Tab-separated table of C-alpha atoms (C1' of nucleotides) in Angstrom:
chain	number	residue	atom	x	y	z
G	1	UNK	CA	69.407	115.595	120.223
G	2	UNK	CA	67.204	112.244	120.392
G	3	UNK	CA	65.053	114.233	122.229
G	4	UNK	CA	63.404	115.071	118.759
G	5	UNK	CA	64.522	112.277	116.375
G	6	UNK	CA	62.964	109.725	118.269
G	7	UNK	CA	59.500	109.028	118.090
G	8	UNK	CA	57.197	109.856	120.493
G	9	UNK	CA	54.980	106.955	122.181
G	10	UNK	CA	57.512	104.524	121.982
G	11	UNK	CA	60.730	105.948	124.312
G	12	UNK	CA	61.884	105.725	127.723
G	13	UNK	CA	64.559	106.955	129.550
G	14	UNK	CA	66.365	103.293	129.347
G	15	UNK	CA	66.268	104.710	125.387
G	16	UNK	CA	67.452	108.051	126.011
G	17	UNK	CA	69.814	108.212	128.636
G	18	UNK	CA	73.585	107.652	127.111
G	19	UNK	CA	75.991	106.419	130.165
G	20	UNK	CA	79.663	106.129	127.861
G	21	UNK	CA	80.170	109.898	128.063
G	22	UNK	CA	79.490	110.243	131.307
G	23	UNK	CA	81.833	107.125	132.831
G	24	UNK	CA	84.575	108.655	130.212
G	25	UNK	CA	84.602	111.784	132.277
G	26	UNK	CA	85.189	109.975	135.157
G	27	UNK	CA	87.809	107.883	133.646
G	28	UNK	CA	89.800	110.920	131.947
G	29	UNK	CA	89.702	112.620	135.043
G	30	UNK	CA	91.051	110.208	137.440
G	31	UNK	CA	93.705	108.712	134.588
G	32	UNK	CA	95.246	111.210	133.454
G	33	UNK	CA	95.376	114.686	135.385
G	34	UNK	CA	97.520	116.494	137.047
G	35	UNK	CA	95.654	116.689	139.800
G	36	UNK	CA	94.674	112.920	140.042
G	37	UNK	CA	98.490	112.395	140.929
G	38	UNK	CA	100.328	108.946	141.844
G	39	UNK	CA	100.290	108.337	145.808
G	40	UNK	CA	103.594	108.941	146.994
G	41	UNK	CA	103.900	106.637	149.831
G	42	UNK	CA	107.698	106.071	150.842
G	43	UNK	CA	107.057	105.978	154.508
G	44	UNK	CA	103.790	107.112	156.722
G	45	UNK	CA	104.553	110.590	156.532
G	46	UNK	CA	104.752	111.391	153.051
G	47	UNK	CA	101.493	109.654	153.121
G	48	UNK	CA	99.875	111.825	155.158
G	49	UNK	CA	101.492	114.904	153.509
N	1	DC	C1'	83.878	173.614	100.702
N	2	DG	C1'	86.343	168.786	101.714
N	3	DC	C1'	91.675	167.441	102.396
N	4	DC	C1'	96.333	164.942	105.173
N	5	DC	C1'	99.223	164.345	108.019
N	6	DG	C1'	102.038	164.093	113.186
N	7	DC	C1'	101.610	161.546	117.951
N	8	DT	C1'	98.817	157.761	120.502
N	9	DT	C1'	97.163	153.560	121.272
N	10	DC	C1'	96.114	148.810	120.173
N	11	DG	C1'	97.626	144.684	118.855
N	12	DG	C1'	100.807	141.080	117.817
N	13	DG	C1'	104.990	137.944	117.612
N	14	DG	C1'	109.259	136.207	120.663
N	15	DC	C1'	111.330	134.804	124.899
N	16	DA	C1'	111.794	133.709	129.340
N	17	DA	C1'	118.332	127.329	132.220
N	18	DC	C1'	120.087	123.635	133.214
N	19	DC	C1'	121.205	118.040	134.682
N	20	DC	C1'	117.539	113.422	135.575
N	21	DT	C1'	112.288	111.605	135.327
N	22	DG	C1'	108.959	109.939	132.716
N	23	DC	C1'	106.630	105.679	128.357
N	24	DC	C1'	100.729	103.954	124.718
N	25	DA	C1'	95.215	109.945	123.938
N	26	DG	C1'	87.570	109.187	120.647
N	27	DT	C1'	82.514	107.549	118.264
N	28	DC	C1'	76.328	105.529	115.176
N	29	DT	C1'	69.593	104.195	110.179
N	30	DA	C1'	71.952	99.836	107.269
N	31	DA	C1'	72.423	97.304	104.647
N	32	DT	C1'	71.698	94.514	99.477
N	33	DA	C1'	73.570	93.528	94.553
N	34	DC	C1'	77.179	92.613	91.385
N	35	DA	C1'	81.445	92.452	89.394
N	36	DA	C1'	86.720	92.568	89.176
N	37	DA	C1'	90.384	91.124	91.562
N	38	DT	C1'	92.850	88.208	94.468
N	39	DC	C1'	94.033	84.322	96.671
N	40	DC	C1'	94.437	79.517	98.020
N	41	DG	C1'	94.027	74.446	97.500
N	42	DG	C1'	94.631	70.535	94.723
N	43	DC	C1'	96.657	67.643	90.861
N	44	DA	C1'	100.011	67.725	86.955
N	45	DA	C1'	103.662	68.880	83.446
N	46	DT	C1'	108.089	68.377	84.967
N	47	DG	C1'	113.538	68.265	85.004
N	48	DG	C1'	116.966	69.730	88.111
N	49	DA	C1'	119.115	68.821	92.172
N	50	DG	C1'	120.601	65.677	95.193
N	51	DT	C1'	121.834	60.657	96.678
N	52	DC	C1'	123.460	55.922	96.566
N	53	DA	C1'	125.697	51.648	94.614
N	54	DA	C1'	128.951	50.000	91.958
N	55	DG	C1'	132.924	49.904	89.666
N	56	DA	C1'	137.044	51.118	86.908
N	57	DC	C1'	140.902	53.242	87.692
N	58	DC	C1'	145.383	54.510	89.197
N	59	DA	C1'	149.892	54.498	91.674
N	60	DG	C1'	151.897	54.342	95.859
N	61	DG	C1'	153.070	52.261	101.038
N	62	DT	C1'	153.194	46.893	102.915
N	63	DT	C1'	154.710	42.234	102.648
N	64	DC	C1'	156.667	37.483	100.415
N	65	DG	C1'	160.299	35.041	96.857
DNA sequence: CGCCCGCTTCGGGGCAACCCTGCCAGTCTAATACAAATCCGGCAATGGAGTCAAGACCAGGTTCG
């Protein structure tokens, strides 16, 4: 998208390159999902298992 | 000639147990300019509401003649 509205001779990738939507994938995925699940450590086993 | 209807299939909504147990989800042209409204801060009319000091006032329980 700012590939075009910005204007040319003047950008960078330091001015293109957004980082929030990216870290917010990481953060949605390891907070809350069903797969990223709570470590159920009662004892050494259930660790391990 | 074009005209219409009986089975077939395609789709579409409804339902599929019950106790506990858990707890808070996203993104960009950017500012001036002005006016009505609102609000809040400070004296300034209070007079009402409370507070004290003083006393007058009884009429009854306590003591002397």
């Amino acid at each position: 998208e700012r590939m075009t509205t910005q204007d040319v001779e003047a950008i960078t990738p330091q001015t293109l390159i957004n980082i929030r939507p990216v870290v917010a994938a990481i953060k949605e995925f390891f907070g809350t999902s069903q797969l990223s699940q709570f470590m159920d450590q009662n004892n050494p086993l259930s660790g391990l298992t």
